[PDB]
């Protein structure tokens, strides 16, 4: 009952995607007329936009006023009447279940059964159960079992690593042995920061433009591994290392390394240092304490 | 039988990626042993 | 050097024709800091003494 | 004395630099400064036959079969090989799907009267023990993708595809004169009583209803080569009828113990001892099969799984999914080996069988029909996953043969 | 006079790391004069005369 970490068993789902986006094309085409193939699916899905540190959204202003009803019964069935027969042609080529699916989604009914729920694969079905038990155990705080699941899973030759947050929070709550969550994360960044589609939303990403979740979370969580303190010049040595200039969050990580190292004229230079990086962190999309609070800690230091 | 166990003295041989240890003892320290081959000397 | 070139950048983005005096004290504080430590690094080279 | 590098600093070479320790560097002259087409029938049948003998190797070796099986297999695979090479067309028209491998294995086993049944095969292959789910598994040969598809396709046995393919082979070469296609019935009864926790009287009960409708004559062909069928022939794979009689027997027997030999309670306690998910090799296996069974609920069943079952599962995963399919590689063996992959307890088969036979050993009012029903439906569930058929398939059969007992009783 | 030298090709590896270098010969093309000093394991035959530049290890 959880997402599976495998490419979905194929044929019928793809030919259904065909029927769907093809009919979609015919209806929206005739709709723009009245307002006047993997590749067909491709163009179709294509022409469309593809007090705490909230990476805020884009709110409501500068957006256009209105519309008033476009679609009566007669007018809609006008748009619908013809593209449904065009569909009658290749429906004759697809399978009866697929045809039924086309009939029902085109009535507007939504199918009872998931792609997983109708999938049936023998190595893949076993991997489905494996991954499932991983997610279930991780939900169940069963970090021991869950760890066994994870190791046995990553063993298998089919799994590339979405599963990393599983192991980040996994080894995190594990505390047991193995070179830990931080080690894993900095490994992720060291292996996958160099040249050395379906599956991919944002929580796993490529390093052309922002790889987000895992990077920022090892960043902050490492600054909290300095909350353990009051290793740092290491963390900001390899936060110093990378150029991926649209961060600023590593500027606040940097200035936090200088506030943690500031806890004699050396300590002075560290306090002037954090004073600098807080403004070169006003460079970008701001992470702000009132920051006169930051400075007030810095005057408790100036003591 | 190229090697010898340093602890139990059992003569034994290895292979490609094999347990670098005595198959009897489990001691992990092995002495090399040496084979019919021509070395030439001058008797002086 | 880079760090002072930044202090010098924020320093010019005064008027303070408006602009409330005291920052004058803090800017000086940062400048003294920079001069002292560069002067130290030079001394150390000519001179670690 | 070589290093090749630094050509030669003399434009009538460049001939080839070795450095002496004295740093002259010296150059030789002496300055010192694809797949087959249209008859890959032969290769196809070779990867197929090779995969078969591979599986036989695993079952004499790892399952302690008899060596005679192999000869029985050369005979059956020989008969149908001779029949597909008594066929002309360059258009292949053969279907050597994996169901044919398992089909001739079961066929041969059943001639030899060995007490192995289809559910043994389903378990064996779904637990990756017996290699199955691949063409020449990841390690072989590059064939026309038309035949790799003729292998990878039709892989599942899980809607009775196995019963249908063994009957189909049983037509392809004839069961009757050539072989002895009587199933090993009574061992299936034992397997079944022990598979529940039924007291040993039900072996003789169901054995008797068996004798009552059949007088114990059980065939293998359901063949009239086609697709087409619509009456009489949901129920003539012997096994499925055995399970049908078994179910029926339990229902009748328990609902008409006017003696009151079987307590209103012990049917519940039987249901609960049957239901308690416990971690033996078997139940762990049935979980592994539950994972690749087509229909819900059985996947909701993986949802409701116990930590030891999952553990022995990952065990069987690292053991029998080394039977997987299809520099930087060792860099990922060390790379993954950077973070850890991570008096004999559980009991044997006749031990479990004994202990539920005892769990009911207290042997010596209309809502007990409920207990009968839930027990029958749990037993059904186990049979459905174990014998790779459908809910609707099973109940079609036991319905038909139940009317087949009422008809020869009324 | 006797001298003992220790050859330890785990000298570079970062602690319990994957092992890059294994005593023995590969299947690429290498001198062959090497087998005059070295046995199949990549260790030198006992008794061998060895002067500056010779192999003592492969
Ligand atoms: Zn020894
Ligand atoms: Zn030259």
Look at E39 and B35 and tell me if their CB atoms are within 8 Å.
yes
* CA atoms of D238 and D380, how far apart (whole Å): 17
Look at E39 and B14 and tell me if their CB atoms are within 8 Å.
no
DSSP state of A165: H
Interface mutation target, options E24, E25, E46, E51, chain B, most CBs of B under 10 Å: E46
Dihedrals phi, psi of D133, to nearest 5 degrees: -70, 30
Site of tokens 């492969």: E58
User: In terms of Cα–Cα distance, which of A152, A209, A219 is closest to A185?
Assistant: A219
Look at A152 and D314 and tell me if their CB atoms are within 8 Å.
yes
Look at A276 and C34 and tell me if their CB atoms are within 8 Å.
no
Entry field: residues in chain D: 410
CB pairs under 8 A between A and D: 95
Contacts of B1 (CB under 8 A, 6+ apart): B11, B12, B13, B33
Q: β-pairing, B11-12 with B30-32? A: unpaired
End-to-end CA distance of chain D: 104
Q: Contact at 8 Å (CB) between D166 and D106?
A: yes
Is the C-alpha dihedral spanning D304, D306, D311, D312 positive or negative?
A: negative
- R_g (Cα) of chain C, nearest Å: 14
Closest partner CB to A177 (pick from D303, D311, D340) = D340
Q: Contact at 8 Å (CB) between C28 and C7?
A: no
**Structural tokens at position A76:** 């809609």
Q: Which whole-number Å values give the CA distances from E27 to A82, D234, D331, E24, E31, in the listed order?
A: 69, 61, 20, 10, 12
Q: Contact at 8 Å (CB) between A24 and A86?
A: no
User: What burial letters (b/e) apply to E23-49, b meaning 16+ CB within 10 Å?
Assistant: eeeeeeeeeeeeeebbbeeebbeeebe
Contacts of D363 (CB under 8 A, 6+ apart): D199, D261, D262, D263, D266
Name the minimum distance, in Å, from the CA of D97 to any CA of chain A. Answer: 15
Dihedrals phi, psi of D288, to nearest 5 degrees: -60, -35
Looking only at Cα atoms, what is the longest distance across chain D?
A: 115
Element (H, E) at A49: none
User: In terms of Cα–Cα distance, which of D134, D349, D161, D359 is closest to D265?
Assistant: D359
User: In terms of Cα–Cα distance, which of D139, D146, D140 is closest to D36?
Assistant: D146
Tell whether domain B2-44 is in CATH 2.20.28.30. Answer: yes
End-to-end CA distance of chain E: 25
User: In terms of Cα–Cα distance, which of D129, D126, D135, D120 is closest to D156?
Assistant: D126
- Hey, what's the torsion of the CAs at D266, D270, D272, D278, to 10 degrees? 140
Q: Is the preceding peptide bond at A149 cis, omega within 30 degrees of 0?
A: no
User: In terms of Cα–Cα distance, which of D219, D220, D222, D221 is closest to D231?
Assistant: D222
Q: Contact at 8 Å (CB) between D309 and D284?
A: yes
| Cβ neighbours of D286 (radius 10 Å) | 23
* CA atoms of A133 and A145, how far apart (whole Å): 9
* CA atoms of D63 and D188, how far apart (whole Å): 18
Q: Contact at 8 Å (CB) between A251 and A277?
A: yes
* CA atoms of D126 and D132, how far apart (whole Å): 8
* CA atoms of A261 and A233, how far apart (whole Å): 9
Sheet containing B3-5: which strands, arranged edge to edge? B11-12, B3-5, B30-32
Tell me if residue D374 falls in helix, strand or coil.
Answer: helix
Entry field: residues in chain E: 58
Look at A265 and C37 and tell me if their CB atoms are within 8 Å.
yes
| Cβ neighbours of D98 (radius 10 Å) | 25
Site of tokens 């037993």: D379
Closest partner CB to D324 (pick from A125, A149, A156) = A156
Q: β-pairing, B3-5 with D25-26? A: unpaired
**Structural tokens at position C17:** 């024709």
Dihedrals phi, psi of D121, to nearest 5 degrees: -65, -50
DSSP state of A153: H
Task: Note whether A164 contacts D: Cβ–Cβ < 8 A.
Answer: no
User: In terms of Cα–Cα distance, which of D244, D169, D159, D259 is closest to D209?
Assistant: D244
Contacts of A227 (CB under 8 A, 6+ apart): none
| Cβ neighbours of B11 (radius 10 Å) | 10
CB pairs under 8 A between B and E: 21
Q: Contact at 8 Å (CB) between D103 and D131?
A: no
Q: Contact at 8 Å (CB) between A287 and A248?
A: yes
| Cβ neighbours of A80 (radius 10 Å) | 15
User: What burial letters (b/e) apply to A33-47, b meaning 16+ CB within 10 Å?
Assistant: eeeeeeeebeebeee
* CB contact residues (below 8 A), chain B span 15-44, against chain E: 16-17, 32-35, 37, 39
DSSP state of A199: S
* CA atoms of D266 and D375, how far apart (whole Å): 11
Q: Contact at 8 Å (CB) between E58 and E24?
A: yes
User: In terms of Cα–Cα distance, which of A147, C42, A242, A45 is closest to D314?
Assistant: A147
* CA atoms of D180 and D11, how far apart (whole Å): 88
Interface mutation target, options A1, A144, A152, A169, chain D, most CBs of D under 10 Å: A152
Q: Contact at 8 Å (CB) between A150 and A181?
A: no
In chain B, domain spans: 2-44
Nearest CA in chain C to A279: C10
* CA atoms of D122 and D387, how far apart (whole Å): 7
Contacts of D44 (CB under 8 A, 6+ apart): D92, D94, D96, D143, D147, D150
* CA atoms of D372 and D353, how far apart (whole Å): 20
DSSP E7-48: --TTSSS-SSPPP---SS--SS---SGGGGTB-TTSSBPTT-
Site of tokens 């196809």: D44
Indicate the burial class of D17 (C-beta count within 10 angstroms; 0-12, 13-18, 19 or more): buried
**Structural tokens at position A138:** 């991780």
Q: Contact at 8 Å (CB) between A126 and D317?
A: yes
Contacts of E47 in chain B (CB under 8 A): 34, 37, 39
Site of tokens 């072996």: D203
DSSP state of D21: T
* CA atoms of D346 and D104, how far apart (whole Å): 34
| Cβ neighbours of D359 (radius 10 Å) | 16
* CA atoms of A56 and A34, how far apart (whole Å): 39
Q: Contact at 8 Å (CB) between D84 and D42?
A: no
* CA atoms of A247 and D193, how far apart (whole Å): 68
| Cβ neighbours of D189 (radius 10 Å) | 20
**Structural tokens at position A245:** 């200039």
C-beta pairs of A235-238 under 8 Å, 24+ apart in sequence: A238/A186, A238/A189
* CA atoms of B2 and A166, how far apart (whole Å): 49
User: What burial letters (b/e) apply to B16-26, b meaning 16+ CB within 10 Å?
Assistant: eeeeeebeeee
Task: Note whether B2 contacts E: Cβ–Cβ < 8 A.
Answer: yes
**Structural tokens at position D280:** 């033996």
Indicate the burial class of A55 (C-beta count within 10 angstroms; 0-12, 13-18, 19 or more): exposed
User: In terms of Cα–Cα distance, which of D287, D101, D381 is closest to A126?
Assistant: D287
Task: Note whether E53 contacts D: Cβ–Cβ < 8 A.
Answer: no
* CA atoms of A80 and D359, how far apart (whole Å): 65
Indicate the burial class of D325 (C-beta count within 10 angstroms; 0-12, 13-18, 19 or more): middle
DSSP state of B6: S
DSSP D290-357: HTT-SSSSHHHHHHT--HHHHHHHHHHHHHHTSS----HHHHHHHHHTTS------S--HHHHHHHHH
Tell me if residue A1 falls in helix, strand or coil.
Answer: coil
Q: Which whole-number Å values give the CA distances from D243 to A195, D120, D398, E8, in the listed order?
A: 59, 15, 8, 67
Tell me if residue A209 falls in helix, strand or coil.
Answer: strand
Q: Contact at 8 Å (CB) between D243 and D394?
A: yes
Contacts of D81 (CB under 8 A, 6+ apart): D45, D49
Q: Contact at 8 Å (CB) between A145 and A137?
A: yes
Site of tokens 């037509």: D171
DSSP state of D19: E
Dihedrals phi, psi of B12, to nearest 5 degrees: -160, 160
Task: Note whether D64 contacts E: Cβ–Cβ < 8 A.
Answer: no
Q: In chain C, after which residues is the C-to-N distance over 2.5 Å, breaking the chain?
A: 46
Tell me if residue C7 falls in helix, strand or coil.
Answer: helix
Element (H, E) at A112: none
**Structural tokens at position D223:** 């063949």
Is the C-alpha dihedral spanning A186, A191, A192, A197 positive or negative?
A: negative
| Cβ neighbours of D199 (radius 10 Å) | 20
Element (H, E) at A26: helix A12-35
Q: Contact at 8 Å (CB) between D393 and D302?
A: no
* CA atoms of A79 and A23, how far apart (whole Å): 12
**Structural tokens at position A20:** 């769907």
Element (H, E) at D104: helix D98-111
Angle at D204 between CA D203 and CA D210, to 5 degrees: 95
Binding residues of B: 5, 8, 22, 25
DSSP state of D90: S
* CA atoms of D106 and D102, how far apart (whole Å): 6
**Structural tokens at position D359:** 């769990």
User: In terms of Cα–Cα distance, which of D124, D95, D408 is closest to D288?
Assistant: D124
| Cβ neighbours of D63 (radius 10 Å) | 14
* CA atoms of C38 and D51, how far apart (whole Å): 77
C-beta pairs of D26-32 under 8 Å, 24+ apart in sequence: D26/D1
DSSP state of A221: H
All chains having 3 or more CB pairs closer than 8 angstroms to chain A = C, D
* CA atoms of D107 and D96, how far apart (whole Å): 15
Sequence-ordered alpha helix ranges (H) in chain C: 2-12, 23-43
Strand partners, D74: none
Tell me if residue A53 falls in helix, strand or coil.
Answer: coil
Name the minimum distance, in Å, from the CA of B36 to any CA of chain E. Answer: 10
């Amino acid at each position: 009952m959880f997402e599976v970490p495998i490419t979905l068993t194929n044929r019928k789902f793809a030919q259904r995607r065909k029927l769907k986006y093809q009919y979609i094309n015919y209806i929206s085409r005739r709709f723009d007329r009245i307002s006047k193939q993997q590749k067909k699916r491709r163009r179709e899905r294509h022409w469309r936009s593809v007090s705490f540190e909230i990476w805020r959204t884009v709110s409501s202003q500068n957006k256009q006023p209105i519309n008033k009803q476009k679609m009566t019964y007669h007018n809609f069935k006008k748009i619908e009447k013809i593209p449904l027969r065009k569909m009658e042609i290749p429906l004759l080529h697809c399978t009866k279940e697929n045809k039924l699916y086309f009939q029902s989604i085109s009535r507007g009914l939504e199918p009872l059964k998931t792609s997983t729920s109708e999938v049936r694969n023998y190595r893949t079905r076993h991997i489905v159960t494996l991954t499932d038990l991983l997610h279930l155990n991780v939900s169940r705080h069963n970090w021991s079992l869950a760890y066994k699941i994870f190791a046995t899973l990553i063993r298998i030759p089919g799994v590339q690593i979405k599963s990393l947050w599983g192991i980040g929070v996994e080894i995190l709550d594990n505390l047991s042995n193995s070179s830990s969550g931080l080690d894993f994360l900095q490994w992720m960044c060291q292996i996958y920061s160099s040249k050395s589609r379906s599956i991919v939303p944002p929580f796993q990403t490529g390093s052309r433009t922002h790889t987000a979740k895992f990077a920022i979370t090892y960043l902050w969580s490492s600054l909290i591994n300095c909350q353990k303190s009051m290793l740092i010049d290491k963390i900001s040595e390899w936060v110093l290392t990378p150029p991926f200039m649209e961060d600023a969050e590593v500027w606040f990580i940097y200035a936090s390394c200088h506030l943690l190292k500031a806890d004699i004229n050396q300590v002075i230079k560290h306090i002037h240092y954090v004073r600098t990086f807080l403004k070169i962190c006003l460079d970008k999309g701001g992470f702000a304490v009132p920051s006169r609070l930051i400075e007030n800690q810095l005057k408790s230091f100036e003591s | 039988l190229k090697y010898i166990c340093a602890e139990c003295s059992s003569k034994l041989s290895l292979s490609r990626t094999d347990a670098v240890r005595c198959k009897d003892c489990g001691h992990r320290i092995l002495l090399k042993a040496r084979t019919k081959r021509l070395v030439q000397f001058e008797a002086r | 050097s880079l760090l002072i070139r930044d202090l010098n950048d924020d320093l010019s983005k005064l008027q303070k024709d408006k602009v409330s005096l005291e920052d004058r004290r803090v800017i000086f504080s940062r400048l003294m800091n920079a001069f002292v430590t560069i002067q130290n690094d030079v001394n150390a080279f000519i001179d670690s003494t | 004395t070589f290093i090749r590098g630094p050509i030669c600093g003399t434009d009538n070479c460049p001939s080839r630099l070795w450095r002496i320790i004295d740093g002259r560097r010296t150059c030789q002259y002496g300055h010192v400064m694809k797949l087959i087409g249209h008859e890959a029938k032969l290769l196809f049948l070779k990867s197929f036959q090779f995969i078969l003998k591979r599986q036989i190797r695993w079952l004499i070796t790892e399952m302690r079969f008899p060596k005679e099986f192999e000869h029985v297999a050369k005979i059956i695979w020989l008969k149908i090989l001779k029949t597909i090479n008594d066929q002309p067309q360059e258009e292949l028209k053969l279907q050597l799907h994996m169901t044919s491998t398992i089909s001739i294995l079961y066929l041969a086993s059943t001639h030899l009267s060995l007490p192995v049944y289809t559910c043994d095969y389903i378990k064996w292959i779904c637990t990756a023990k017996m290699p199955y789910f691949q063409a020449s598994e990841i390690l072989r040969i590059q064939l026309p993708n038309y035949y790799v598809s003729i292998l990878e396709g039709s892989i599942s046995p899980f809607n009775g595809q196995l019963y249908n393919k063994i009957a189909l082979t049983c037509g392809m070469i004839h069961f009757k004169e050539f072989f002895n296609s009587e199933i090993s019935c009574q061992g299936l009864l034992l397997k079944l009583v022990m598979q529940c926790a039924l007291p040993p009287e039900f072996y003789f009960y169901t054995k008797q209803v068996i004798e009552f409708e059949e007088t114990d004559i059980r065939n293998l062909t359901l063949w009239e080569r086609t697709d087409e069928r619509h009456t009489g022939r949901v129920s003539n794979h012997a096994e499925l009828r055995v399970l049908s009689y078994f179910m029926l027997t339990i229902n009748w027997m328990l609902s008409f113990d006017r003696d009151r030999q079987y307590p209103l309670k012990w049917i519940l306690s039987l249901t609960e001892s049957l239901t308690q998910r416990t971690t033996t090799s078997e139940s762990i296996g049935r979980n592994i099969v539950k994972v690749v069974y087509p229909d819900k609920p059985t996947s909701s069943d993986y949802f409701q799984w116990s930590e030891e079952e999952t553990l022995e599962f990952l065990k069987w995963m690292e053991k029998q999914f080394l039977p997987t399919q299809t520099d930087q590689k060792i860099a990922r063996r060390k790379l993954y080996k950077i973070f850890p992959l991570d008096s004999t307890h559980q009991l044997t088969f006749i031990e479990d069988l004994q202990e539920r036979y005892a769990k009911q050993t207290p042997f010596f009012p209309p809502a007990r029909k409920e207990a009968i029903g839930r027990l029958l439906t749990h037993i059904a569930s186990q049979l459905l996953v174990d014998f790779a058929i459908s809910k609707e398939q099973l109940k079609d059969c036991i319905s038909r043969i139940k009317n087949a007992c009422l008809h020869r009783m009324n | 006079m006797y001298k003992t030298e220790k050859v330890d090709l785990a000298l570079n590896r970062n602690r319990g790391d994957p092992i890059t270098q294994h005593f023995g010969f590969g299947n690429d093309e290498w001198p062959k004069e090497w087998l005059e000093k070295l046995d199949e394991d990549g260790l030198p035959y006992i008794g061998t005369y060895v002067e500056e530049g010779d192999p003592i290890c492969a």
